[PDB]
């Protein structure tokens with residue numbers, strides 16, 4: 001990864017399906 | 028959009044298959060060639 005240690009720590013804490021159905025799309 | 032396009036021609040026709048076909052994250056694009064360079068957007 002091209003991130004920094006602080007960026008890596010940030011991206012590992014945001015972590016908390018819904019692929020597609022009934023015309024629901026995510027761009 | 029959001030369609031693996033080995034199976035587009037299932038539904039004025041050159042843009043359904045043939046020529047050159049490209050796979051992007053949003054979907055896939057038909058009618059354009061994928062170069063190996065980089066330019067301004």
Ligand SMILES: *[C@@H]1O[C@H](CO)[C@@H](O)[C@H](O)[C@H]1NC(C)=O
Pocket residue numbers: 031032033
């Ligand atoms: C698209 O379909 C082809 C054959 O049907 C398969 O080889 C390929 O892995 C598929 N790609 C995706 C992203 O599903």
